Design a protein around this ligand. Structure first.
Ligand SMILES: [Mg+2]
Ligand SMILES: [Mg+2]
Ligand SMILES: [Mg+2]
Ligand SMILES: [Mg+2]
Ligand SMILES: [Mg+2]
Ligand SMILES: [Mg+2]
Ligand SMILES: [Mg+2]
Ligand SMILES: [Mg+2]
Ligand SMILES: [Mg+2]
Ligand SMILES: [Mg+2]
Ligand SMILES: [Mg+2]
Ligand SMILES: [Mg+2]
Ligand SMILES: [Mg+2]
Ligand SMILES: [Mg+2]
Ligand SMILES: [Mg+2]
Ligand SMILES: [Mg+2]
Ligand SMILES: [Mg+2]
Ligand SMILES: [Mg+2]
Ligand SMILES: [Mg+2]
Ligand SMILES: [Mg+2]
Ligand SMILES: [Mg+2]
Ligand SMILES: [Mg+2]
Ligand SMILES: [Mg+2]
Ligand SMILES: [Mg+2]
Ligand SMILES: [Mg+2]
Ligand SMILES: [Mg+2]
Ligand SMILES: [Mg+2]
Ligand SMILES: [Mg+2]
Ligand SMILES: [Mg+2]
Ligand SMILES: [Mg+2]
Ligand SMILES: [Mg+2]
Ligand SMILES: [Mg+2]
Ligand SMILES: [Mg+2]
Ligand SMILES: [Mg+2]
Ligand SMILES: [Mg+2]
Ligand SMILES: [Mg+2]
Ligand SMILES: [Mg+2]
Ligand SMILES: [Mg+2]
Ligand SMILES: [Mg+2]
Ligand SMILES: [Mg+2]
Ligand SMILES: [Mg+2]
Ligand SMILES: [Mg+2]
Ligand SMILES: [Mg+2]
Ligand SMILES: [Mg+2]
Ligand SMILES: [Mg+2]
Ligand SMILES: [Mg+2]
Ligand SMILES: [Mg+2]
Ligand SMILES: [Mg+2]
Ligand SMILES: [Mg+2]
Lengths: 113, 223, 145, 115, 118, 55, 337
RNA sequence: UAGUAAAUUUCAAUAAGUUUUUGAAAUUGAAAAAUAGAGAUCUACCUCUAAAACUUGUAAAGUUUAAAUUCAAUAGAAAACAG
RNA sequence: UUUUAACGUACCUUUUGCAUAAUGGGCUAGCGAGUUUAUAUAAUUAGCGAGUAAUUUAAAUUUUAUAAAAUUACGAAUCGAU
RNA sequence: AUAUUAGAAUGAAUAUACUAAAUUUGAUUAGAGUACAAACAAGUAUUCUAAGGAUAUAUGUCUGUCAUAUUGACCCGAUAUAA
């Protein structure tokens, strides 16, 4: 068959039982590993954007704005910054986060409360 | 299918080097041998699971296939349509040789126009190869005739006999069986000169059509 | 026997102007390739004498010019340009054989005579679309091969 | 040049027939004279050829036949129909291409002119 | 074209006209080449009655056309060459223009720099 | 109408052949309509020669 | 020159020149053009003749030069180089004298009993009707090997042209060298080997030598695993390819050219041309004549009488004279044109 | 090579499913080259032939040897001592 | 190598359609299925070209190049129940 | 637009249809071709050309019936016969 048998046994080293040695189980259980991975990679770029929001949506409510009206100004504003960094900032570099948060409020004439 | 792409002008035949003529440094020009994908031998090839046969029908089987007679029990084209008359009876006909061939040779030097043209003179020159039952002077390329000619053949037609005699010349039609023709063309095999026949009715009725065309005729006359 | 009905009218419509052809742009490339104006010949031509006997017409003429390529007659004394067809005669091509020398200088000169038609170089011959036999033999004699 | 030639690539005679084309009192009258087992050759289909006559040059071939519903009942038909029978009817391409295969010898003129 | 069918019917549901000829089955053929003209007129009591005439003018030549062009070379065939056609200029295709990819982001090189070589 | 403009003369040799026939057909049809006698103009069934006229 | 094949070839004369001093060169056209233009373009020039030296046969490189040259023929040694024509030769030769007799066994030829080992129903296992089938024990292949025959034909004017190409390559590649004569004082292998090994140790050599050989040579060249000899009559494309070098003697070259220059004519023969015994056929009766019948004929002696041995001719001769008397013989005489 | 040649009904093999010829079963049975028979039924004309025997060694399976074409132990043979 | 988080109902066959509680396989190694010959037609790469195409050389007895040989087969002419 | 228009039903016609009458056999022969429809084969309407007739101002009209169904392939065989 297509993938050699020296090659199946690499993709199925740490499998359970007869799903590592024998062929009538290993081949379809390696194939699903690769159908899943092709899927889990395009899903990988989804989950982080769910995380990047979820860290921003809680670091920004300490400053008494919610997520939606924050980025609403961010696109109005001149600034290009991503949701990636704004996550990394609020954790690791928090002072600069409040800086960025201020002009965004101001260039949009937004007023927290 | 049979259809294959012509080799373009952009595809190189050479191999970018000057290699010797050894039994290893040989090749032939591409497009000279198509290679069919071996059947039944892989998903990756498009003909593995089934060798292009299909799903389970009759043509999918060993020895599967109806003939080009069959139409589903429906009555075929043969036993439906009517039957026609008889085929030819005179299967033993001369050939038709256009002036465009005998005159082509004369302009070369393969034939002497000053001598009577015969069947052998055309055989040796290379006008034709095989001729049982003689020759006919069916006319295409009449207008190229430049000089007087003197033919001696088995048959001819109206326009040629006319178009020759305008310039001059003549035509003499002869009756000869194959055993006589083959004495004329291949004299080496018939060292005994053969008698002349006396022909039956059917030869006469064709041979009198010829005399009506203004030709000359040679055959043993019946009483 | 004279026709009638539509089978005569169509037979008479050759003497009427045409209705212009809507065409795929692939033709529009071709007619731009084919109607492209001519160019001068790099190798000049010598005239055929008049009142030449047919026994002499089949003979060659003497070359005057120093040419890179040559073309050979047969073992019969005729020029090796021939026509080719399908089984149904829908592809119609002339052929040339027994070529020597720089072929690229032979195609540049050939394409001038055939109104810049498609040329298919093959091993030992050159196929060209369109029956243009008489035009070539009138050109090769007129050079003296 | 073959240093050794087999016996089976030589001529092969059939089985149910004699070893000679002549007989004596002691010979057999069930079995027949001798023959040669040649390799199969697709033969022209003798029925087709009697329903057809062949037409045209080697590069555009056509098949002439006579139409049907012409012989038994004639009283029951219009002059137009019976006059639409007398003419030629050349075969249709969809049937002509099923039928080349039953005529391996078609383009040979010696076959055509006899048909 | 003449001897061409314009209608098949049962009775004169579409009446005939001029330059035609009807048949046994009340068909409607034409008599000469041209264009059709359906004419209708009303009777005393609002009956629609339609005819099938033809306007006997001629018709476009879509069937027998001359052959395509060819350009004979003059010093080979000069007499054929006087009648040569002029070169067509057909707009086969439209010239496209590429997309200009940004280049600021692919940074620039520095020459004769300083480093912490080891 | 005539197509003066050039074309491959042996590609489309039939086109030359077809044209010359149509031109002959015109002249064959004009000469008759000039030289014909009014008997020949009529259809068949009135070209005939009866002795006794009607009544 | 494909033209001028239908004319009969006159006897061949080497146009030798005596050119002392240095060994003349012969310029190969550039390699690049011979790659892109490898079928339209010759290896060497065609108007300029091929002045090729004639060297000794037992003599080293620098020291071997007589002082003479030959002018070879373009049609044989200056044709375009076409592997297309050679490849279709080699596949032909390899398959003309070949038969395959090996056969593999089918489901029928294989031993067995032609029954069912067990019925279909109630056994709880597969349907195994026929025995020794493919896939099963001692099975026979359904699509195995068969006995057959591999000879197929090839057009004859390219069994020819595939030789002229090769000789036009050994001269062009560099290899072939011309020889004055094959001639050795002794029939002993000591003569060739000593001068040969220093000349060329590694080269499978071919030599083409005339019909009339020297006996001193035929006994010596054998035992030498590198060498191989051929008459010009028999020179196959393979023998030039299998062997690296090739030598040609001066007199044998007349015999080779006059053969090929005739072997074309036999094929290219416009029918109105008259052939006959050619110089290639005539030179092969002088050497190996064919035994002819005896010239012993009898002449009539009108002075003396006749007496035949066969009883019938007597009775046929006696009745003959009787009809001279009566004058009835003329009934039997004929006059057919 | 006179109970022969040939004939009538049937069948066989002759390419032919039918109308010959060559032979067989049953029944009848001739002449004397001046005669007799075939030539796709019958007639005429003409042509051809002469109805006796004998004669082409190696065919075949099996063993062995030499060579070519092939397999290399789930192949080749059923069997690398196995009918 | 373990734990956690999210996602996720095998495979082949057959079918309008199956995780299917529809068929089939206890796993592993090895055997295991479009092949051979001939004719005709088409297309592709080539040879020669109004001409083209040879090997019952299956031999010769040291043992060869496939050395001849175009009789023959196809061919630039079709129309008609004949 | 009913009456009707040979018979089922639809469609259409009203110069239809119905009715009276005088002359008459176009309910004839041959050859070429388009169009509709249409897998194939089959079926349908009819102009144009030629011969030979009827009608009778003909100048012209008619190649079975108002229309659509009112039947059957090919083979084998048959009567009359323009070969
Ligand atoms: Mg997204
Ligand atoms: Mg697929
Ligand atoms: Mg599978
Ligand atoms: Mg199946
Ligand atoms: Mg199915
Ligand atoms: Mg199927
Ligand atoms: Mg079957
Ligand atoms: Mg099929
Ligand atoms: Mg009939
Ligand atoms: Mg008829
Ligand atoms: Mg009408
Ligand atoms: Mg068995
Ligand atoms: Mg079980
Ligand atoms: Mg069984
Ligand atoms: Mg086995
Ligand atoms: Mg083969
Ligand atoms: Mg030849
Ligand atoms: Mg029988
Ligand atoms: Mg039989
Ligand atoms: Mg009998
Ligand atoms: Mg008897
Ligand atoms: Mg007898
Ligand atoms: Mg008889
Ligand atoms: Mg007879
Ligand atoms: Mg005997
Ligand atoms: Mg092992
Ligand atoms: Mg084992
Ligand atoms: Mg075993
Ligand atoms: Mg889950
Ligand atoms: Mg099923
Ligand atoms: Mg189901
Ligand atoms: Mg499906
Ligand atoms: Mg599901
Ligand atoms: Mg379960
Ligand atoms: Mg089930
Ligand atoms: Mg299941
Ligand atoms: Mg099932
Ligand atoms: Mg199970
Ligand atoms: Mg298993
Ligand atoms: Mg088990
Ligand atoms: Mg396995
Ligand atoms: Mg009715
Ligand atoms: Mg009604
Ligand atoms: Mg009638
Ligand atoms: Mg349609
Ligand atoms: Mg039809
Ligand atoms: Mg009807
Ligand atoms: Mg009527
Ligand atoms: Mg039947």
């Amino acid at each position: 068959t297509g993938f050699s048998r020296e090659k199946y046994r690499k993709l199925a080293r740490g499998f359970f039982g007869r799903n590592k040695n024998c062929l009538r189980t290993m081949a379809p259980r390696v194939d699903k590993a690769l159908r899943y991975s092709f899927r889990d990679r395009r899903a990988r770029r989804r989950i982080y954007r769910k995380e990047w929001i979820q860290t921003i949506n809680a670091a920004v409510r300490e400053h008494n704005t919610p997520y939606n009206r924050f980025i609403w100004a961010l696109n109005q504003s001149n600034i290009i910054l991503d949701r990636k960094i704004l996550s990394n900032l609020a954790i690791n570099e928090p002072f600069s986060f409040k800086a960025v948060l201020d002009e965004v409020r101001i260039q949009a004439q937004l007023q927290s409360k | 299918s049979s259809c294959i792409k012509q080799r373009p002008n952009d595809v190189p035949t050479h191999r970018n080097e000057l290699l010797p003529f050894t039994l290893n440094n040989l090749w032939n020009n591409p497009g000279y041998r198509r290679k069919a994908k071996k059947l039944g031998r892989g998903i990756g090839s498009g003909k593995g699971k089934t060798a292009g046969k299909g799903t389970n029908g009759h043509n999918s089987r060993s020895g599967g296939g109806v003939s080009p007679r069959f139409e589903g029990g429906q009555t075929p084209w043969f036993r439906r349509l009517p039957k026609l008359g008889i085929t030819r009876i005179n299967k033993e006909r001369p050939k038709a040789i256009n002036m465009s061939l005998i005159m082509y040779a004369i302009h070369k030097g393969r034939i002497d126009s000053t001598k009577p043209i015969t069947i052998k003179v055309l055989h040796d020159a290379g006008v034709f190869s095989t001729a049982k039952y003689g020759v006919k002077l069916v006319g295409r390329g009449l207008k190229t005739i430049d000089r007087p000619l003197h033919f001696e053949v088995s048959d001819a037609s109206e326009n040629v006999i006319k178009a020759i005699k305008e310039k001059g010349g003549s035509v003499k039609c002869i009756y000869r069986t194959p055993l006589q023709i083959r004495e004329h063309v291949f004299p080496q095999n018939y060292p005994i000169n053969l008698r002349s026949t006396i022909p039956p009715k059917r030869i006469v009725k064709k041979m009198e059509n010829i005399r009506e065309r203004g030709a000359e005729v040679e055959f043993n006359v019946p009483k | 026997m004279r026709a009638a009905g539509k089978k005569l009218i169509q037979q008479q419509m050759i003497l009427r102007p045409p209705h212009p052809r809507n065409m795929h742009p692939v033709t529009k490339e071709a007619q731009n390739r084919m109607t492209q104006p001519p160019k001068p010949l790099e190798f000049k031509l010598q005239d055929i004498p008049a009142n030449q006997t047919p026994e002499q017409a089949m003979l060659p003429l003497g070359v005057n010019q120093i040419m890179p390529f040559s073309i050979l007659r047969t073992h019969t004394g005729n020029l090796p340009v021939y026509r080719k067809y399908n089984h149904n005669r829908t592809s119609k091509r002339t052929i040339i054989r027994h070529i020597e020398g720089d072929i690229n200088k032979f195609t540049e000169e050939l394409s001038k005579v055939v109104s810049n038609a498609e040329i298919h170089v093959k091993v030992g011959r050159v196929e060209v679309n369109g029956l243009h036999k008489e035009s070539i033999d009138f050109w090769l004699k007129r050079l003296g091969f | 040049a073959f240093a050794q030639f087999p016996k089976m690539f030589k001529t092969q005679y059939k089985k149910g027939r004699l070893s000679s084309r002549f007989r004596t009192k002691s010979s057999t009258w069930k079995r027949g004279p001798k023959t040669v087992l040649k390799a199969h050759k697709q033969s022209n289909h003798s029925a087709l050829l009697k329903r057809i006559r062949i037409v045209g040059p080697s590069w555009d071939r056509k098949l002439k036949f006579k139409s049907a519903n012409h012989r038994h009942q004639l009283r029951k038909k219009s002059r137009a129909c019976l006059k639409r029978k007398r003419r030629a009817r050349y075969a249709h391409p969809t049937d002509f291409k099923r039928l080349r295969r039953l005529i391996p010898s078609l383009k040979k003129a010696s076959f055509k002119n006899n048909h | 074209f003449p001897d061409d069918i314009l209608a098949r019917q049962r009775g004169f549901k579409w009446h005939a006209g001029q330059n035609t000829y009807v048949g046994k089955d009340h068909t409607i053929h034409s008599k000469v080449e041209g264009h059709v003209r359906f004419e209708k007129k009303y009777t005393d009591t609002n009956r629609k009655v339609v005819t099938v005439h033809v306007e006997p003018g001629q018709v476009r030549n879509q069937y027998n056309r001359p052959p395509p062009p060819f350009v004979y070379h003059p010093e080979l065939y000069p007499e054929r060459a006087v009648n040569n056609p002029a070169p067509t200029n057909f707009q086969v295709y439209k010239q496209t223009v590429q997309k200009v990819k940004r280049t600021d982001f692919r940074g620039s090189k520095v020459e004769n720099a300083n480093r912490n070589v080891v | 109408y005539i197509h003066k403009t050039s074309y491959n003369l042996e590609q489309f040799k039939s086109y030359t052949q077809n044209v010359e026939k149509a031109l002959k057909d015109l002249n064959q049809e004009k000469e008759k309509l000039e030289n014909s006698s009014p008997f020949d103009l009529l259809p068949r069934r009135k070209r005939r020669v009866y002795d006794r006229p009607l009544h | 020159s494909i033209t001028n094949y239908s004319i009969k070839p006159v006897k061949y004369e080497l146009k030798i020149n005596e050119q002392p001093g240095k060994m003349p060169i012969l310029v190969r056209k550039p390699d690049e053009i011979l790659v892109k233009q490898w079928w339209s373009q010759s290896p060497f020039e065609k108007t300029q003749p091929l002045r090729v030296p004639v060297l000794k046969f037992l003599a080293e490189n620098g020291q071997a030069y007589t002082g003479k040259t030959v002018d070879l023929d373009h049609d044989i040694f200056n044709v375009p180089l076409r592997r297309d024509i050679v490849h279709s030769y080699v596949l032909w030769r390899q398959n003309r004298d070949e038969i395959k007799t090996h056969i593999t066994k089918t489901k029928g030829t294989v031993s067995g009993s032609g029954k069912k080992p067990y019925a279909q129903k109630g056994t709880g296992k597969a349907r195994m009707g026929n025995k020794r089938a493919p896939g099963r024990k001692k099975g026979g292949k359904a699509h195995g090997a068969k006995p057959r025959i591999l000879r197929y034909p090839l057009n004859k004017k390219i069994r020819l042209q595939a030789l002229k190409v090769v000789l036009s390559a050994k001269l062009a590649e560099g290899k072939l060298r011309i020889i004055e004569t094959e001639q050795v004082d002794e029939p002993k292998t000591r003569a060739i080997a000593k001068m040969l090994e220093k000349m060329d140790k590694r080269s499978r050599i071919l030599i083409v030598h005339p019909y009339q050989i020297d006996t001193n040579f035929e006994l010596a060249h054998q035992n030498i695993q590198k060498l191989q000899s051929c008459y010009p009559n028999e020179l196959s494309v393979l023998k030039v390819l299998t062997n690296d070098r090739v030598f040609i003697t001066l007199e044998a070259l007349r015999q080779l050219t006059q053969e090929l220059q005739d072997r074309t004519f036999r094929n290219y023969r416009m029918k109105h041309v008259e052939r006959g015994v050619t110089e290639s056929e005539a030179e092969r009766e002088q050497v190996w004549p064919t035994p002819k019948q005896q010239d012993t004929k009898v002449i009539y002696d009108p002075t003396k009488p006749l007496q035949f041995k066969f009883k019938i001719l007597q009775d046929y001769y006696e009745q003959y004279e009787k009809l001279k008397e009566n004058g009835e013989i003329q009934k039997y005489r004929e006059n057919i044109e």
